[PDB]
Design a protein around this nucleic acid. Structure first.
Ligand SMILES: [Cl-]
Length: 513
RNA sequence: AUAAAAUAACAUUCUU
């Protein structure tokens, strides 16, 4: 009566408690959620041998791991800035733990150790899709058909699992035979049709631009949807915005969110807006149309959403902007002022707004726009991060009207802000900004001379490297930014024979490293 | 827990 009784009881407690947390709108409950998942994954390997491990209990774990991926992504965007790739971060490790946990469960399902239901199969395949493992989703789904336990095999063939698979099948095969078969059956059917089957078929017809069949199915999904499970209406509505090549239909659904015309609640997912903006730019080359959609999105967001969302939006907008004004810094500068005035009228300016603008403005290769952005940080009273000081240093590599004194000054300001904001060491992004302001600029000038037919930037670069080497996050960064950097920028090989001498005369002033 | 179990923005600075 107790093969693994107590471990089954504590499994149901932490899984249900963590699922209730991740579905209801640091803190102790936050720590409870992540510890419950590690505990649940700990008990899983023990309960994997038990026959009393219901396909329900395993589906609840897969759903929990899926909500963990959703929470880990939400924590990344809520941060004041993205963590450096070369440093330890909760987002990186927790994502790998979740992914590996889901990879172990999938293999156990394919082996036959553990059963699963269609509700768990959907969360397992949706998780791998969110992890950019689309090809693996098809292989697990097709391998599920050849399984001993028909119960698990029948689960992967349920309509809600097929609904998730329809968009992947049309992307891989371009086949509309089975989708057109289902459309003729679903439209006339008087029986229950799962909403995920509606949603997957709508997305296929949106990509195939059979909008009348997509809109007809969307109407049936609309009249049948339940308030408790209205999320299917969100996915499809957003799919009309970011996946429809018909920009008139995509904008009609976009204004339906702006004007709050839908009976169901719906977020203006910035990934959907970014795809919509890119489709307008690629199809029409009309910046005014892009600018009009971006204005409505900024007004819709305001101060309601996290700063990382507006950072993603402005990244898409300013990338399009400086592609349009790549050869016109005169009209572009006046346009930026209009953009700055509008953005100020909506909310207080965040740092990523000017960070993105300054980064993409490097193709103008003018110092005035660098000094303009730098003064606007203080003029608009922007809460500063180390991102701006990194970009301000990197910006010097795109102009000639600069000196080694300013390069060192903007490096010192970075190191001061690193220590002021409690940074441990010097990250890769800090040295890359210094590398782009010296080595890359020098290499570009030499390539111009060969193609055509404050004295030295590289000397200051190698001098700062040696002076600040003890403050590095790892001494392997010395090889990365000298010998390894010379592999892509060969002009550095001419300076590295004397790096052993390493005469230095910089001016560090550290505090609270 | 039972035609059910929905929805989750992958941001600016980072070739090694
Ligand atoms: Cl910071």
């Amino acid at each position: 009566a107790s093969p693994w009784r107590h471990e089954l009881l504590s499994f149901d407690e932490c899984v249900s408690s963590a699922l209730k947390y991740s579905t209801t709108p640091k803190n102790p409950s936050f720590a409870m959620f992540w510890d419950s998942m590690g505990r649940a994954m700990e008990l899983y390997y023990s309960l994997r041998e038990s026959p009393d491990f219901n396909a329900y209990r395993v589906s609840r774990l897969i759903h929990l791991l899926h909500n963990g991926l959703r929470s880990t992504r939400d924590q990344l965007v809520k941060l004041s800035r993205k963590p450096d790739y070369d440093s330890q971060s909760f987002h990186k490790e927790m994502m790998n733990f979740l992914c590996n946990s889901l990879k172990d469960i999938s293999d156990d399902i394919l082996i036959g150790k553990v059963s699963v239901s269609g509700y768990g199969a959907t969360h397992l395949l949706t998780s791998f899709k969110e992890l950019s493992f689309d090809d693996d989703c098809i292989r697990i789904w097709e391998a599920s058909k050849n399984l001993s336990d028909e119960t698990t095999s029948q689960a992967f063939q349920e309509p809600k699992v097929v609904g998730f698979m329809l968009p992947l099948l049309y992307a891989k095969t371009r086949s509309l035979t089975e989708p057109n078969e289902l459309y003729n059956q679903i439209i006339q059917s008087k029986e229950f049709i799962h909403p995920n089957l509606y949603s997957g078929l709508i997305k296929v017809f949106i990509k195939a631009e059979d909008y009348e069949k997509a809109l007809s199915l969307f109407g049936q999904l609309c009249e049948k949807a339940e308030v408790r499970n209205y999320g299917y209406l969100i996915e499809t509505h957003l799919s009309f915005i970011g996946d429809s090549k018909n920009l008139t239909l995509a904008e009609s659904f976009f204004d339906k969110i702006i004007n709050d015309e839908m009976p169901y609640k719906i977020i203006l997912q910035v990934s959907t807006v970014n795809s919509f903006l890119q489709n307008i730019w690629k199809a029409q080359n009309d910046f005014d149309h892009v600018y009009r959609i971006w204005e409505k999105a900024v007004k819709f967001y305001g101060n309601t959403v996290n700063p990382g969302i507006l950072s993603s939006l402005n990244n898409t907008f300013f990338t399009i902007f400086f592609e349009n004004y790549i050869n016109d810094n005169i009209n572009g500068f006046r346009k930026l002022q209009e953009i700055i005035t509008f953005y100020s009228g909506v909310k207080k300016i965040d740092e990523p707004f000017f960070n993105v603008m300054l980064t993409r403005a490097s193709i103008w290769h003018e110092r005035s726009i660098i000094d303009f952005i730098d003064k606007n940080y203080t003029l608009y009273h922007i809460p500063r991060t180390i991102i701006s000081y990194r970009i301000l240093l990197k910006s010097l590599g795109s102009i000639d009207n600069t000196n080694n004194e300013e390069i060192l000054d903007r490096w010192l300001e970075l190191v001061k802000k690193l220590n002021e904001l409690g940074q441990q060491y010097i990250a890769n992004a800090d040295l890359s900004a210094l590398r782009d302001a010296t080595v890359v600029w020098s290499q570009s000038k030499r390539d111009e001379k060969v193609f055509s037919a404050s004295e030295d930037r590289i000397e200051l670069y190698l001098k700062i490297l040696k002076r600040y080497t003890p403050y590095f996050r790892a001494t392997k960064q010395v090889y990365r930014y000298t010998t390894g950097c010379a592999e892509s920028y060969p002009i550095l090989n001419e300076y590295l024979s004397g790096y052993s001498d390493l005469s230095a005369e910089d001016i560090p002033v550290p505090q609270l490293h």
